DNA sequence: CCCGAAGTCCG
DNA sequence: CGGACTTTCGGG
């Protein structure tokens, strides 16, 4: 069975714009895990937009398969389409989709396709179904992969008022120790999103509960502004 | 335009 | 460690 003809048409677009210049320093920057073509987001975008216009987009029938397909694929502009793809079919997401989005999180993994991922994606499920986080959260913290660790994490980031706080400070809590670099800064960054919108009790927690330094520091990153820094 | 959100380099 | 500074992306 061939490739989807939407995905053969997107790699031989893609393939014919590639840039090997930049491809070197962009693979550098994610650290070698990755081949790259070469090509950045707003021309990325273009070459899909240019392969919709001419071949419409797939059916819905057929959405995880594209999206399998170029996830397989070894450039990782096309995990980045594959994502920009997903964001076309957003209507079609639901909770049923949980074990989909868990296996694109724990397969081609770095920063950048689970940042993707995560916040919005899964940000937005667990949103509408608040109930189903304690069938996955608990797990994704017990798992020896450190992208659903942050994923339990940062599926919150968004969630501002709505976030729910003695959740957020247990699954920290749970991974408080943890020598990661990639756990320790997402535990940063949605302390310092969530003191955006209440401030005091991030800085209460930071100020009465471990955390590595580099969570705390980057936790406190503005509103240290706020509170003072003590001789 | 602006600002806020991985990487290298250097005490 | 944490500060200084980098490019790229998203969004106001
Ligand atoms: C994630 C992130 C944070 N800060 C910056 N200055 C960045 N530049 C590119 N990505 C960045």
Redesign the pocket.
């Known amino acids: 069975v061939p490739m989807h003809p939407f995905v053969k048409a997107l790699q031989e677009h893609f393939t014919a714009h590639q840039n090997p210049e930049?491809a070197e320093?962009?693979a550098?920057?994610?650290?070698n895990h990755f081949l790259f073509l070469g090509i950045?987001?707003?021309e990325?975008?273009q070459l899909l937009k240019d392969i919709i216009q001419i071949h419409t987009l797939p059916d819905q029938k057929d959405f995880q398969i594209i999206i399998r397909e170029l996830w397989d694929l070894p450039e990782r502009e096309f995990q980045a389409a594959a994502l920009?793809i997903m964001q076309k079919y957003k209507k079609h997401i639901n909770e049923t989709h949980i074990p989909f989005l868990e296996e694109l999180i724990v397969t081609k993994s770095w920063?950048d396709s689970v940042?993707?991922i995560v916040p919005t994606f899964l940000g937005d499920i667990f949103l509408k179904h608040p109930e189903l986080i304690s069938a996955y959260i608990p797990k994704w913290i017990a798992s020896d992969n450190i992208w659903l660790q942050?994923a339990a994490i940062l599926f919150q980031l968004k969630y501002k008022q709505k976030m729910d706080e003695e959740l957020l400070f247990w699954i920290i809590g749970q991974l408080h120790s943890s020598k990661e670099?990639?756990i320790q800064?997402?535990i940063?960054?949605v302390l310092?999103?969530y003191a955006?919108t209440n401030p005091d009790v991030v800085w209460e927690y930071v100020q009465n509960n471990e955390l590595?330094?580099?969570s705390?520091?980057?936790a406190i990153?503005?509103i240290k502004q706020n509170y003072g820094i003590n001789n």
């Open positions: 930049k320093p962009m550098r920057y994610m650290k950045q987001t707003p990325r975008r920009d920063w940042d993707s942050r670099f990639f800064k997402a940063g960054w310092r999103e955006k590595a330094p580099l705390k520091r980057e990153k503005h």
